[PDB]
Amino acid sequence: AFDAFLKIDGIPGESSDDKHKDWIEIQSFAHKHAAYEITHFLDKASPKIYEACCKGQHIKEITIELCRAGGDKYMEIKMEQVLIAKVEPHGSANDFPSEKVSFTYGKIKWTYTQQAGGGNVSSG
Amino acid sequence: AFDAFLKIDGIPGESSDDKHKDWIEIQSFAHKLEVNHAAYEITHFLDKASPKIYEACCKGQHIKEITIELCRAGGDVKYMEIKMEQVLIAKVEPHGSANDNGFPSEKVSFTYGKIKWTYTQQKRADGGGNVSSGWDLTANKAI
Amino acid sequence: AFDAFLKIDGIPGESSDDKHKDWIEIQSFAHKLEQAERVNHAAYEITHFLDKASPKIYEACCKGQHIKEITIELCRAGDKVKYMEIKMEQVLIAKVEPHGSANDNFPSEKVSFTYGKIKWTYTQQRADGGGNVSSGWDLTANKAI
Amino acid sequence: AFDAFLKIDGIPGESSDDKHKDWIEIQSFAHKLEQPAVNHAAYEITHFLDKASPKIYEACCKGQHIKEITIELCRAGGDKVKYMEIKMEQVLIAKVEPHGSANDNFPSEKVSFTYGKIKWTYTQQKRADGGNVSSGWDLTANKAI
Amino acid sequence: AFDAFLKIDGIPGESSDDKHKDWIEIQSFAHKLEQPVNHAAYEITHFLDKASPKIYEACCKGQHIKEITIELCRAGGDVKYMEIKMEQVLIAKVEPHGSANDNFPSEKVSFTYGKIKWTYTQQKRADGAGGGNVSSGWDLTANKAI
Amino acid sequence: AFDAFLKIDGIPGESSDDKHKDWIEIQSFAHKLEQRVNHAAYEITHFLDKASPKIYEACCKGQHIKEITIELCRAGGDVKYMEIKMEQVLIAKVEPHGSANDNGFPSEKVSFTYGKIKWTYTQQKRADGAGGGNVSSGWDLTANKAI
């Protein structure tokens, strides 16, 4: 299972999942110290994502979670003092069109939940 | 993919779609922002608009506004409208190859001055609304 | 999977097409028109199999032979459904690059064309319309045709 | 693929191998030895985000001097048969870099190690028809081991 | 694909083709010429063969070679369709490449010239062999035609 | 895919081949003689083997090595047809690389800075013996002239 979810504070989403309502569904996540990028389909959050990026709106917090279908969370990435740096909508054949949005920050926190036989291992 | 259509104010197309007669049929679109805004790139199979599109770029014709509409399948189900104003055809790159095994296409880029986005939601098995935003790139302060 | 054709004023080819007499059959084409200083018109790249025209095309580039006129046509496979005619004047072969590989099923060359005048002519064909929508540019005179 | 494992003394890992309990799993490595005009590069590995991940992010951002790190490349052959042993002393975790591409199934990262001493303990097989040829280099004194 | 063969003035090959004894068989060629006349290096790829060691020498030794000719053949007959004759030759760069996955290893060698001549032969049709020998040429030395 | 082998004088290998015992089996070779010729280096890639650890010493050692000879083989016997003897060599750059995904048995890319070289082809006849003799050539870049 992949089951990844992103909550952007300012912008609400369109996911209707069990653990993450009005979140945004993310089909790709990537990192680098520089920026954190994701890919998602064109949906509810996209127009308000552009505003923040162009506004260079100091954005407080963004969080990502990676759960599994079995017992519908194994990883949590938390980043503050965020700023959407760049978003790009593509679309050609097969694809639903998608866009890759990239976030910059001055602080970060990451949290793996190892099975608990390991409890919660975190970093920042 | 989807089912997308484009209206250039100055330059009409030749599609026979119902909701969009003589719009331009578009098979690829791409954009990127930062603000270091870029250009909305659209690709269309060589249509009747091509000759005038070429000249409009060369004439630097200020196109007042263009509208791109992406609709879903099982209907046209419009779900996003990109209305860009103060536009200008910047780079038109017509291409065509035998290995393409498709129609001679052509990518046209557009330097805009104002932009708008409009996500139309669906329902809730019974939902949602028209979430929007825009920039005034000519006064780098939102709408 | 298309049907494309090119004619060079001084250099003929070996097409067997009835309407295209002995023109040059092209297997790929490309162009780019960028941009308040001016507009960035690029070269018309045309790939075609090494043919009877190849030797003369080579010399023309090296000599800097200023050709008068060249034309491109695009037809569909009911055949002869011409849909696009590209005519350029005050032309000059800038670059020509032959290649081969003993793998791809025939060795071909790609010829680039710099011109001084251009003309596009789309023709549309269902109820038994559009005619010939057309355009050009006089880029020696920085004004349109 | 292979069966590779890594031990840093200060920070423990979470692997379950028979031969390597609570180690670090390494999915790629890379190193380079260049003789210009001698010059030593720095050691790369990949491992998943796990229990061991945070204590390096300290040594990266903090710069923690560590005693010894060791890599064991093992063959399959049922019981893992270690065929290469890399031992490095006077270590310092250099730049830490996390990457993840959402089609290699959870985030990953590339850690680079600097050292003052290296070791290579190659172990060969012989079936029924084997050897421990090794070497080392202490770059603190730029000499052999 | 195609069936191409290259004979340079001196170094012979190990090819056993009927039409070209001890020639060089070539699997790929490439050339470019651009009026700013800027010419480029004629390039070929061929396997490592009888010619191979004497090729590496003329490059470092700088040995001036009078003439090289290449012929391009279709399959089903080696009806020829192109003759490249180039005079005043010299090996510029040679690169023997060989891998396991990527085949028989090969070497891509690069040529400069002072004169060049092209000779296309048209397929015998019912109208005739046609252009027979359509040609053109250029003496880079005299920066003029041939 | 060929049958390639390398003889390093100092560092032994682990080939199980009958013609080249405890040699270096080679998976890829590369070279580039340009032109005032701009000579390069001989690159070859192979699996990590019994040669691997003593290769790192020879690189770091600045270790001047006298001779390496490498062979290329056909089938119909394991029949050598190219002998490349590089003289006054030196391991300039060696890069062990592992990746798992496409790295079954990791490999290393070792480059060799030679001072002299000697190519030696051996054409094989399709009759009694190996007609073709031993066409050969060579060069010495220390004194920047031929062999």
Coordinates of C-alpha atoms in Angstrom, one line a residue, chain B residues 14 46-48 50-52 54-60 88-99 101-104, chain C residues 1-2 27-35 39 41 44 74 76 83-84 86 120-122 124 133-137 144-145:
Chain B
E14 CA -12.1 24.3 -36.3
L46 CA -2.3 21.5 -37.2
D47 CA -5.7 23.2 -37.6
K48 CA -7.2 26.2 -39.5
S50 CA -2.3 27.5 -37.3
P51 CA -1.7 30.1 -40.2
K52 CA -3.2 33.0 -38.2
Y54 CA 1.9 31.9 -36.7
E55 CA 1.2 35.5 -38.0
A56 CA -0.2 36.6 -34.6
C57 CA 3.1 35.7 -32.9
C58 CA 5.0 37.5 -35.7
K59 CA 2.7 40.5 -35.5
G60 CA 3.0 40.6 -31.7
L88 CA 0.6 37.3 -26.7
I89 CA 1.6 34.3 -28.8
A90 CA 5.3 33.9 -27.9
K91 CA 6.8 30.7 -29.4
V92 CA 4.9 28.4 -31.9
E93 CA 6.8 25.2 -32.6
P94 CA 5.0 23.1 -35.3
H95 CA 6.4 19.5 -35.5
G96 CA 5.6 16.2 -37.3
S97 CA 7.4 12.8 -37.7
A98 CA 6.6 9.4 -39.2
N99 CA 7.6 7.7 -35.9
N101 CA 2.4 7.7 -35.9
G102 CA -0.1 10.5 -35.1
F103 CA -1.1 13.9 -36.5
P104 CA 1.4 16.7 -37.2
Chain C
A1 CA 2.4 7.4 -40.8
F2 CA 1.7 10.6 -42.8
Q27 CA 9.9 11.7 -43.3
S28 CA 10.0 14.4 -40.6
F29 CA 9.5 18.2 -40.3
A30 CA 9.9 20.9 -37.6
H31 CA 10.1 24.7 -37.0
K32 CA 10.0 27.4 -34.2
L33 CA 8.8 31.0 -34.2
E34 CA 9.7 32.8 -30.9
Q35 CA 9.6 36.6 -30.0
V39 CA 10.5 37.7 -33.7
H41 CA 12.3 32.8 -36.8
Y44 CA 12.9 24.6 -41.3
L74 CA 1.0 17.8 -46.3
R76 CA -3.6 12.6 -45.8
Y83 CA -4.2 20.1 -45.8
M84 CA -1.1 22.3 -45.6
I86 CA 4.4 25.8 -46.7
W120 CA 1.4 29.0 -44.8
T121 CA -1.8 27.6 -46.5
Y122 CA -4.2 25.4 -44.6
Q124 CA -9.9 22.1 -44.8
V133 CA -6.8 30.0 -44.6
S134 CA -3.4 31.5 -45.3
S135 CA -0.6 33.8 -43.9
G136 CA 2.9 34.9 -44.5
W137 CA 5.6 37.2 -43.3
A144 CA 3.6 40.7 -42.7
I145 CA 2.4 39.3 -46.0

